[PDB]
Design a protein around this ligand. Structure first.
Ligand SMILES: CCC(O)(O)CCCCC[C@H](NC(=O)[C@H]1CC12CCN(C)CC2)c1nc(-c2ccc3c(c2)[C@H]2CC[C@@H]3C2)c[nH]1
Ligand SMILES: [Ca+2]
Ligand SMILES: [Ca+2]
Ligand SMILES: [Zn+2]
Length: 368
């Protein structure tokens, strides 16, 4: 039936600024929060302010030298760290900005706190829209991500769950999470992403894991223009087969909204309903679930998407007419919650979708 939902948010998160021209805008998290507050979604959720994750909590995965660097670097002392900046890939995509470490602490704190709440059986679902920073590596920042809150949250869930399923619907391949668990069978990673002349360049359908992790990494490479019909046609059958074969006891779902139509960096054509159908599919399995944010660069659509996915988690119907809110003008000219797909061509033919699904089904037959 209806599930208990715990939501993590710090009111300071929207003030972190990556810099002029940078597509990553933490302000979209504040827009999401304000929109869901104005729809009355706080009446049914337990809202928590995450703690600031310590350097020590982050080193359960990341190297001590990398976390020490993140805790020390600032725009005013950058000149003295040119060597470490190159070593840790801090530069254009992952810039040094005021409060960088505190931003990482809040993003991570929400994910780890949600995982602890799930481990204690005190909630059915935990939501952290500030998390889902899937590209960060053990000793390297990557693709706007510095600390991999997902890996840290999964490590927390592994304290009480033998098998954890990670599902990533961001348009970009979830490389940092896949790499962290590539040689283990205790985590199965499933990523649906655009593949071909696109960041980060990984996630080929032939990348299936290694050693004890062979067959525990699943990648569904897609081309431009995927729509609700095509995505829905493969998501439920793949996830149903993964649930059947792997039998996870907890799930983490990365809900990156850059797979929506009209995204500044993405080239997919999903609507908010099509994207949210993934949340509905996962929720139906009735397993402890951690829902996280991720990409999303047309910020009015990210706020619409995550507001609707929070309503989905709560089993609460909300009207298409947007309520008045602090950012009302950002939702013009329509002031509606749902979006329309564009006229872009879907390069993923129905035959391509079925063929890739069949190759993934062959790999899933190899599980014990
Ligand atoms: C949160 C999860 C997630 O998955 O959604 C994260 C997605 C990350 C996409 C990263 C991608 N980077 C790249 O494609 C890497 C090969 C480069 C090209 C761009 N230059 C600056 C660095 C080297 C990329 N970077 C940009 C980008 C656009 C505009 C700018 C920048 C990056 C910086 C330099 C100018 C401004 C700031 C676009 N695409
Ligand atoms: Ca993905
Ligand atoms: Ca794995
Ligand atoms: Zn992305």
């Amino acid at each position: 039936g209806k599930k208990k939902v715990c939501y993590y948010y710090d009111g300071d998160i929207g003030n972190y600024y990556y810099g002029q021209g940078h597509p990553m805008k933490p302000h979209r998290i504040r827009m999401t929060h304000n929109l869901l507050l104005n729809y009355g979604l706080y009446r049914k959720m337990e809202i928590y302010r995450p703690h600031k994750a310590t350097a020590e909590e982050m080193t359960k995965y990341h190297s001590d030298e990398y976390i020490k660097f993140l805790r020390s670097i600032r725009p005013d002392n950058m000149s003295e760290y040119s060597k470490q900046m190159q070593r840790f890939n801090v530069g254009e995509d992952c810039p040094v900005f005021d409060g960088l470490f505190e931003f990482c602490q809040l993003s991570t704190g929400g994910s780890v706190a949600g995982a602890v709440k799930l481990n204690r059986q005190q909630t059915d679902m935990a939501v952290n829209w500030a998390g889902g920073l899937h590209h960060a590596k053990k000793s390297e920042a990557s693709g706007f991500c510095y600390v991999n809150d997902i890996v840290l949250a999964i490590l927390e869930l592994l304290k009480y769950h033998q098998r954890v399923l990670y599902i990533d619907i961001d348009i970009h391949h979830g490389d940092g999470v896949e790499e962290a668990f590539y040689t283990t069978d205790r985590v199965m990673t499933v990523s649906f992403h655009k593949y071909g002349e696109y960041f980060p360049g990984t996630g080929d359908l032939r990348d299936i894991g290694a050693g004890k992790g062979k067959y525990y990494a699943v990648n569904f490479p897609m081309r431009d223009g995927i729509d609700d019909e095509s995505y829905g046609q493969i998501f439920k059958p793949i996830i149903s087969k993964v649930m059947e074969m792997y039998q996870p006891s907890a799930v983490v779902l990365q809900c990156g909204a850059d797979s929506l139509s009209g995204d500044r960096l993405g080239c997919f054509n999903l609507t908010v309903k099509g994207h949210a159908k993934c949340v509905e599919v996962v929720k139906t399995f009735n397993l402890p679930l951690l829902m996280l944010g991720g990409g999303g660069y047309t910020i009015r659509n990210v706020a619409r998407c995550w507001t609707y996915e929070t309503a989905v988690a709560l089993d609460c119907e909300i009207p298409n007419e947007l309520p008045y809110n602090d950012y009302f003008e950002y939702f013009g000219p329509d002031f509606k919650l749902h979006i329309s797909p564009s006229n872009m061509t879907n390069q993923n033919t129905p035959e391509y979708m079925e063929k890739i699904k069949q190759r993934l089904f062959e790999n899933l037959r190899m599980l014990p």
